[PDB]
Amino acid sequence: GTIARTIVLQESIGKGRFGEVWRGKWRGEEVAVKIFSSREERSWFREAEIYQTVMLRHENILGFIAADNKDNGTWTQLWLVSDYHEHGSLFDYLNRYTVTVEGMIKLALSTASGLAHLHMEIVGTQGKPAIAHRDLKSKNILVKKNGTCCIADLGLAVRHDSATDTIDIAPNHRVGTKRYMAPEVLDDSINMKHFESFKRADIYAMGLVFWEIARRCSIGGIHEDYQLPYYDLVPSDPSVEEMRKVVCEQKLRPNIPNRWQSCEALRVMAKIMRECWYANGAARLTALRIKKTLSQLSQQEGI
Numbered sequence: 001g002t003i004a005r006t007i008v009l010q011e012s013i014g015k016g017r018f019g020e021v022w023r024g025k026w027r028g029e030e031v032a033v034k035i036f037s038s039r040e041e042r043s044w045f046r047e048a049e050i051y052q053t054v055m056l057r058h059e060n061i062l063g064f065i066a067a068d069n070k071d072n073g074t075w076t077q078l079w080l081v082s083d084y085h086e087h088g089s090l091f092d093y094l095n096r097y098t099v100t101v102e103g104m105i106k107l108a109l110s111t112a113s114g115l116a117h118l119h120m121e122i123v124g125t126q127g128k129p130a131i132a133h134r135d136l137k138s139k140n141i142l143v144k145k146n147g148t149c150c151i152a153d154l155g156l157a158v159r160h161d162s163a164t165d166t167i168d169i170a171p172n173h174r175v176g177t178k179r180y181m182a183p184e185v186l187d188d189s190i191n192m193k194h195f196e197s198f199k200r201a202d203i204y205a206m207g208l209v210f211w212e213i214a215r216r217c218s219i220g221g222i223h224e225d226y227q228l229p230y231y232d233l234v235p236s237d238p239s240v241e242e243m244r245k246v247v248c249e250q251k252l253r254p255n256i257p258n259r260w261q262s263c264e265a266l267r268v269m270a271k272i273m274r275e276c277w278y279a280n281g282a283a284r285l286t287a288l289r290i291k292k293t294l295s296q297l298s299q300q301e302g303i
């Protein structure tokens, strides 16, 4: 179509399970283009569908531009064009850098604001359904030039129909990254007919992302090396069974160092992590509550 024909692909930046991401140039601006082959149409259409949700746009959700198709004369490519963020993922960003207390708050608060907006239902003519991500992880969050985050990779999301309490794709199977799966997802006790259960599972994964950020907070030169949650307990690419034995059976969570109690910002962050990590989903903090807590901390710090 008219958009893909005017875009020049410059570099393949990533190869995921669904599609390949490229840095492209559109009307002289950098854009990110996710390309799927003809046989991945279901995945491409679903992601285009979630990104076109009414009232979805928010400073902390990846800016979607357009879905399109491009025929090179041999095969057709299915495109999803979005805003380009040079830092890339929060995973890449935390591996490369350490952050200040201010930097940590900015990353955590923006992640929570994006999640609170996904989770929020807006009632009306131009109403927005509540949305649950189902695959929140530091590799699915991007860092913007201003040091704030935006949630990306919404292709596995589910949308709620509030009047009937029904989910748009009626999920009957476990999806997402095994390492970040909530205890109720790992042991398959989650009620997949209960939308609030998917919001609660996202909060647990956001808790693990906050732990990743806090390790990289550098105070008086003190900080931890980058690690994925459960790095000390499971192998790389862990199985459901491996995760379940740790999270559900032994009931372990990532370690919270006592030295996070000697700094106010880290203390608040530690308290949030613990309250995201309860085995009972109903006891977890909401994304709005986390946003309110970190907004108060940001104000106190003068960011």
Ligand SMILES: Nc1cccc(Nc2ncnc3[nH]ccc(=O)c23)c1
Pocket (backbone or CB within 6 Å): 013, 014, 021, 032, 033, 034, 062, 080, 081, 082, 083, 084, 085, 086, 087, 088, 089, 142, 152, 153, 154, 155
């Ligand atoms: N869901 C979705 C759809 C289309 C592109 C993307 N990825 C990106 N978007 C914007 N900047 C980026 N920078 C670096 C790596 C990326 O992967 C990236 C995700």
